[PDB]
Every structure is written in structure tokens, then in C-alpha cells.
Amino acid sequence: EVLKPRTLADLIRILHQLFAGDEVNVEEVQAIMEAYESDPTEWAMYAKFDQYRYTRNLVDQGNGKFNLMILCWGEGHGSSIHDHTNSHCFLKMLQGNLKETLFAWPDKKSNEMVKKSERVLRENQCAYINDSVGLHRVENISHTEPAVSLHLYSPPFDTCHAFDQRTGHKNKVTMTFHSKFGIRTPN
Numbered sequence: 001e002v003l004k005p006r007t008l009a010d011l012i013r014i015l016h017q018l019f020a021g022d023e024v025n026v027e028e029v030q031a032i033m034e035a036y037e038s039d040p041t042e043w044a045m046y047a048k049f050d051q052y053r054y055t056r057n058l059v060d061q062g063n064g065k066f067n068l069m070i071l072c073w074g075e076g077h078g079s080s081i082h083d084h085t086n087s088h089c090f091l092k093m094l095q096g097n098l099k100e101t102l103f104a105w106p107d108k109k110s111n112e113m114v115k116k117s118e119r120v121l122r123e124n125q126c127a128y129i130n131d132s133v134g135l136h137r138v139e140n141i142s143h144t145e146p147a148v149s150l151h152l153y154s155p156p157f158d159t160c161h162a163f164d165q166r167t168g169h170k171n172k173v174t175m176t177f178h179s180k181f182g183i184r185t186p187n
């Protein structure tokens with residue numbers, strides 16, 4: 001009985017409704033994002049890759065309630081271990097596959113970080129994370145094919161922390177957009 005968006009535009013319209021209010025039903029959003037069948041014809045205009053690192057490509061600003069963006073992972077590209085700055089964070093596969101590794105939070109002592117979970121996200125699957133769930137690292141499983149994912153963050157945020165797996169020490173990172181609405185940013 002999940003409402004099924006027929007197009008990426010349908011999905012955006014539904015998301016505007018689900019985030020209009022004060023309450024957000026996480027499992028409802030997750031099921032609707034998963035029900036959208038990834039269609040490259042609809043999102044190729046956002047799929048702008050870089051040789052060396054993954055790119056973040058803004059799709060929609062959600063009337064200030066959320067940011068919807070597409071992340072393009074080249075061959076072998078991966079993220080650092082990071083948090084999500086107290087926001088809801090949804091990630092849905094559009095092409096290829098990402099491995100998500102969940103980590104525990106470090107405390108004050110210096111120590112190797114501890115893995116809590118490890119999985120590969122399947123075709124069209126939508127995962128969810130927030131800071132109470134843990135930290136995570138995401139990476140393209142493939143060294144021969146790209147991965148593309150659709151990310152929804154609410155509230156939007158443009159800073160996070162990256163964590164050193166060897167010690168748990170963290171550094172603030174400013175996140176930037178490679179493109180917005182299909183247009184390359186100055187960089």
C-alpha cells in the first residue's frame with residue numbers, strides 16, 4: 001500500500017508533502033524513496049562525476065525543509081567516516097552498489113574505531129541514518145563501475161565531522177556542491 005512515485009518529479013512532490021509538517025515518519029519516507037524505480041533518463045542531468053572523489057549534486061532545496069541531492073561515486077570512490085550533524089539522512093541507490101559500514105562513536109580516549117554493522121545496499125534500496133544510529137562510511141563496491149545514490153538530509157546541513165579510524169579523532173569538514181540543479185558550481 002506504499003505510495004509509488006512513477007518519476008523522480010513525483011518523488012520530489014511527495015517529499016514536499018511529507019516534510020511540510022513538524023513530524024516526519026521515517027519509515028514512511030524510506031518506503032516511498034525505495035518505491036521510486038531509479039530511472040537514469042530522469043536523473044542523468046545530475047550525474048556529474050569527478051576523477052578523484054565522489055561528487056555531491058543538488059537536486060532540490062525542499063522549501064528549506066530538506067536538501068535532496070545525488071552523489072556520484074567513481075570507480076573505487078568512498079567517503080570518510082562521518083556524522084550527519086543531527087539531521088535525518090536517507091540514502092537510496094540509483095545505480096551500482098554502495099557498502100555502508102556503521103561505526104560506534106569514539107569517546108575521549110584515543111583508540112581504533114569499532115565497526116557495528118556492514119552491508120551492501122541493493123538496487124533501489126533506501127537506507128537511513130542519524131547520529132543516534134552511529135557514524136558511517138560509504139563506498140562504491142566496484143573498481144570497474146560507478147555508483148550513484150540519492151540522498152535526503154533534513155534539516156539541511158553543510159558541515160560535518162570526519163573521523164580518523166585509527167584514533168577516533170575528528171575534524172570539522174565543510175561540504176560543498178559539485179553542481180546545483182544540473183549546473184556546475186564555481187569550485
Ligand SMILES: [Fe+2]
Nearest residue numbers: 082084136138
Ligand atoms: Fe553519510
